[PDB]
Design a protein around this ligand. Structure first.
Ligand SMILES: CC[C@H]1CN(CCOc2ccc(OC)c(OC)c2)C(=O)[C@@H]2CCC[C@H]1N2S(=O)(=O)c1cc(Cl)cc(Cl)c1
Length: 128
């Protein structure tokens, strides 16, 4: 399925080239511009664990998730991944634990040493 496909066919978007964050662009976005550091970014997403369980979805809340890019307000994989996206893009991101919740995990839903799969849609980005 989609997690296997990004695992096997995704692009390594890490600066270290350590395959910690792999990406496939699923829906091509608009033009060429990507957000810059400190922009307010608006995303919809869903996340799955490697046991197949959904652990989160903004769609199910009927509101986007909003954060300031490149400030560590989200896991490293998201700061790295969302920075590569165009407005209107949908991508898949496969996030090894070193770019996610590491050995700690995040109670109650994310175990230790968890590889995470996300589908992310970049709705908008704006400077403040
Ligand atoms: C409010 C939901 C949000 C939680 N966060 C932000 C809080 O977790 C952080 C933030 C910054 C961090 O390092 C700079 C960090 O390192 C472990 C975790 C996420 O980064 C990631 C990515 C953005 C969407 C959500 N999570 S998530 O889906 O992995 C998630 C969902 C749920 Cl239901 C619980 C958890 Cl613990 C995480």
């Amino acid at each position: 399925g989609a997690p296997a496909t990004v695992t096997e066919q995704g692009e390594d978007i890490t600066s270290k080239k350590d395959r910690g964050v792999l990406k496939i662009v699923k829906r091509v976005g608009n033009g060429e511009e990507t957000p810059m550091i400190g922009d307010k970014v608006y995303v919809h997403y869903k996340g799955k664990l490697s046991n197949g369980k959904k652990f989160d979805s903004s769609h199910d809340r009927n509101e986007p998730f909003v954060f300031s890019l490149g400030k560590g307000q989200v896991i490293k994989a998201w700061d790295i991944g969302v920075a590569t996206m165009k407005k209107g893009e949908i991508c898949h991101l496969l996030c090894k634990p070193e770019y996610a919740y590491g050995s700690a995990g995040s109670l109650p839903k994310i175990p230790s040493n968890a590889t995470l799969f996300f589908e992310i849609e970049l709705l908008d980005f704006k400077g403040e």
